Scaffold this active site. Sequence first.
Site, PDB file in Angstrom:
ATOM      1  N   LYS A  13    -108.973 -11.793 -13.440  1.00 33.83           N
ATOM      2  CA  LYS A  13    -109.910 -13.042 -13.206  1.00 33.83           C
ATOM      3  C   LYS A  13    -110.621 -12.555 -11.832  1.00 33.83           C
ATOM      4  CE  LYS A  13    -106.884 -16.689 -14.240  1.00 33.83           C
ATOM      5  NZ  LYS A  13    -105.572 -15.622 -13.837  1.00 33.83           N
ATOM      6  N   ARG A  88    -108.403 -26.098 -14.929  1.00 32.23           N
ATOM      7  CA  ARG A  88    -107.471 -25.336 -15.176  1.00 32.23           C
ATOM      8  C   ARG A  88    -106.323 -26.465 -16.319  1.00 32.23           C
ATOM      9  NH1 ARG A  88    -105.299 -21.241 -11.578  1.00 32.23           N
ATOM     10  NH2 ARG A  88    -106.945 -21.533 -10.731  1.00 32.23           N
ATOM     11  N   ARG A 156    -100.107 -13.319  -0.801  1.00 33.22           N
ATOM     12  CA  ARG A 156    -100.510 -14.478  -0.626  1.00 33.22           C
ATOM     13  C   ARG A 156     -98.801 -15.362  -0.522  1.00 33.22           C
ATOM     14  NH1 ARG A 156    -103.301 -16.701  -6.147  1.00 33.22           N
ATOM     15  NH2 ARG A 156    -105.861 -14.703  -6.380  1.00 33.22           N
ATOM     16  N   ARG A 167     -95.192 -20.795 -12.235  1.00 30.14           N
ATOM     17  CA  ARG A 167     -96.818 -20.824 -13.042  1.00 30.14           C
ATOM     18  C   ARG A 167     -96.853 -20.201 -14.048  1.00 30.14           C
ATOM     19  NH1 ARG A 167     -99.872 -17.212  -8.382  1.00 30.14           N
ATOM     20  NH2 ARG A 167     -98.473 -16.657  -7.641  1.00 30.14           N
TER      21      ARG A 167
HETATM   22  N1  ANP Z   1    -106.934  -4.972 -15.744  1.00 28.37           N
HETATM   23  C1  ANP Z   1    -105.938  -4.468 -14.903  1.00 28.37           C
HETATM   24  N2  ANP Z   1    -104.495  -3.115 -14.915  1.00 28.37           N
HETATM   25  C2  ANP Z   1    -104.077  -3.770 -14.156  1.00 28.37           C
HETATM   26  N3  ANP Z   1    -103.512  -3.605 -12.622  1.00 28.37           N
HETATM   27  C3  ANP Z   1    -104.532  -5.115 -12.642  1.00 28.37           C
HETATM   28  C4  ANP Z   1    -105.488  -4.522 -13.618  1.00 28.37           C
HETATM   29  N4  ANP Z   1    -106.654  -6.165 -13.201  1.00 28.37           N
HETATM   30  C5  ANP Z   1    -105.657  -6.085 -12.665  1.00 28.37           C
HETATM   31  N5  ANP Z   1    -104.613  -5.880 -11.627  1.00 28.37           N
HETATM   32  C6  ANP Z   1    -103.458  -6.566 -10.833  1.00 28.37           C
HETATM   33  O1  ANP Z   1    -102.897  -7.513 -10.898  1.00 28.37           O
HETATM   34  C7  ANP Z   1    -103.214  -8.448  -9.992  1.00 28.37           C
HETATM   35  C8  ANP Z   1    -103.819  -9.305 -10.865  1.00 28.37           C
HETATM   36  O2  ANP Z   1    -104.974  -9.335 -10.806  1.00 28.37           O
HETATM   37  P1  ANP Z   1    -105.655 -10.146 -10.260  1.00 28.37           P
HETATM   38  O3  ANP Z   1    -107.123  -9.782 -10.448  1.00 28.37           O
HETATM   39  O4  ANP Z   1    -105.796 -10.161  -8.149  1.00 28.37           O
HETATM   40  O5  ANP Z   1    -105.192 -11.828 -10.991  1.00 28.37           O
HETATM   41  P2  ANP Z   1    -105.568 -13.571 -11.042  1.00 28.37           P
HETATM   42  O6  ANP Z   1    -106.151 -13.469 -12.582  1.00 28.37           O
HETATM   43  O7  ANP Z   1    -106.708 -13.796 -10.156  1.00 28.37           O
HETATM   44  N6  ANP Z   1    -104.145 -13.625 -10.589  1.00 28.37           N
HETATM   45  P3  ANP Z   1    -104.416 -15.889 -10.358  1.00 28.37           P
HETATM   46  O8  ANP Z   1    -105.230 -15.433 -10.009  1.00 28.37           O
HETATM   47  O9  ANP Z   1    -103.011 -15.911  -9.969  1.00 28.37           O
HETATM   48  O10 ANP Z   1    -104.757 -16.540 -10.973  1.00 28.37           O
HETATM   49  C9  ANP Z   1    -103.852  -7.810  -8.347  1.00 28.37           C
HETATM   50  O11 ANP Z   1    -102.448  -7.404  -8.006  1.00 28.37           O
HETATM   51  C10 ANP Z   1    -104.760  -7.304  -9.398  1.00 28.37           C
HETATM   52  O12 ANP Z   1    -104.498  -5.559  -8.763  1.00 28.37           O
HETATM   53  N1  AMP Z   2    -107.889 -25.877 -10.898  1.00 29.39           N
HETATM   54  C1  AMP Z   2    -107.427 -25.806 -10.402  1.00 29.39           C
HETATM   55  N2  AMP Z   2    -106.320 -27.210 -10.606  1.00 29.39           N
HETATM   56  C2  AMP Z   2    -104.702 -27.206 -10.065  1.00 29.39           C
HETATM   57  N3  AMP Z   2    -104.581 -26.272  -9.249  1.00 29.39           N
HETATM   58  C3  AMP Z   2    -104.508 -25.667  -8.987  1.00 29.39           C
HETATM   59  C4  AMP Z   2    -106.509 -25.215  -9.878  1.00 29.39           C
HETATM   60  N4  AMP Z   2    -106.744 -24.027  -9.404  1.00 29.39           N
HETATM   61  C5  AMP Z   2    -105.742 -23.608  -7.860  1.00 29.39           C
HETATM   62  N5  AMP Z   2    -104.666 -24.331  -8.346  1.00 29.39           N
HETATM   63  C6  AMP Z   2    -103.926 -23.627  -7.345  1.00 29.39           C
HETATM   64  O1  AMP Z   2    -103.415 -22.631  -6.566  1.00 29.39           O
HETATM   65  C7  AMP Z   2    -102.409 -22.182  -6.879  1.00 29.39           C
HETATM   66  C8  AMP Z   2    -102.406 -20.932  -6.544  1.00 29.39           C
HETATM   67  O2  AMP Z   2    -103.989 -20.363  -7.672  1.00 29.39           O
HETATM   68  P1  AMP Z   2    -105.202 -18.979  -7.852  1.00 29.39           P
HETATM   69  O3  AMP Z   2    -105.527 -18.358  -7.086  1.00 29.39           O
HETATM   70  O4  AMP Z   2    -105.429 -19.629  -9.211  1.00 29.39           O
HETATM   71  O5  AMP Z   2    -103.554 -18.230  -8.572  1.00 29.39           O
HETATM   72  C9  AMP Z   2    -102.467 -22.182  -8.876  1.00 29.39           C
HETATM   73  O6  AMP Z   2    -100.495 -22.592  -8.202  1.00 29.39           O
HETATM   74  C10 AMP Z   2    -102.473 -23.843  -8.501  1.00 29.39           C
HETATM   75  O7  AMP Z   2    -101.340 -24.615  -7.067  1.00 29.39           O
END
Ligand code: ANP
Ligand code: AMP
Length: 214
Positions: A13, A88, A156, A167
């Site tokens: 995302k 969420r 992070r 998570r």
């Molecule tokens: N399509 C893909 N294939 C392989 N690696 C990926 C891909 N997309 C993202 N990544 C990597 O994997 C990790 C997760 O992608 P990221 O865009 O940060 O995800 P996120 O869904 O935003 N997670 P979170 O922020 O915890 O809710 C980062 O290290 C990215 O570099």
């Molecule tokens: N919409 C949300 N509701 C509850 N917790 C959240 C929310 N958004 C982010 N957080 C907190 O942020 C942590 C990491 O967020 P993220 O950057 O989306 O992976 C999650 O474990 C939650 O604790």
Amino acid sequence: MRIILLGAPGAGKGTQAQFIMEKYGIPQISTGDMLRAAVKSGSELGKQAKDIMDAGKLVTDELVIALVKERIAQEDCRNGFLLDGFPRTIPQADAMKEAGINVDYVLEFDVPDELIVDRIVGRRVHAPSGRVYHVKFNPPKVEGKDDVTGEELTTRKDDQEETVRKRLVEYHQMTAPLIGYYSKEAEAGNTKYAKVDGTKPVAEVRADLEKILG
Ligand SMILES: Nc1ncnc2c1ncn2[C@@H]1O[C@H](COP(=O)(O)OP(=O)(O)NP(=O)(O)O)[C@@H](O)[C@H]1O
Ligand SMILES: Nc1ncnc2c1ncn2[C@@H]1O[C@H](COP(=O)(O)O)[C@@H](O)[C@H]1O
């Protein structure tokens, strides 16, 4: 257009939001970014998220819900926005009706569970921007450094394998039912829905995305 990025942690995302934001010009509004900023700067709003984040638990609805509304108003939500990490929980889903924020597209990135750990432990971000990279799957052009500013990349606090295991449970228990939810808003006509395959390569999810979008 307003857009919600729904998906498991590490589905990709944040990585695609950057591109949607660059391409379409709509601002990117992410809660986790927000919260991590509040606790670092010491902010009254959101500085309480520290401990819950660390535990890998989701923060309370009522605090996340305020951050959002506070952002949606700060001279940019008119060109519309992108919700990277919200809503969420269903209650978070509900506050958006009961405040009037509608949306145009709801993109679900599906990515197998057995894939998350390694995607999160290789994560390196640039907090002052939100750019994410992956040492192995999407490394930066220069090792350990951001592409746009030459700055040092950090990891992070919550990206430890045990925490991401916490998570996923929360996500399966509280966030996953939102798929069904917007599937319903879709059926009524309030928004468009589309499931994308987040296991494809970075350049390949963006195309698919542009292909849905325009
Ligand atoms: N399509 C893909 N294939 C392989 N690696 C990926 C891909 N997309 C993202 N990544 C990597 O994997 C990790 C997760 O992608 P990221 O865009 O940060 O995800 P996120 O869904 O935003 N997670 P979170 O922020 O915890 O809710 C980062 O290290 C990215 O570099
Ligand atoms: N919409 C949300 N509701 C509850 N917790 C959240 C929310 N958004 C982010 N957080 C907190 O942020 C942590 C990491 O967020 P993220 O950057 O989306 O992976 C999650 O474990 C939650 O604790």
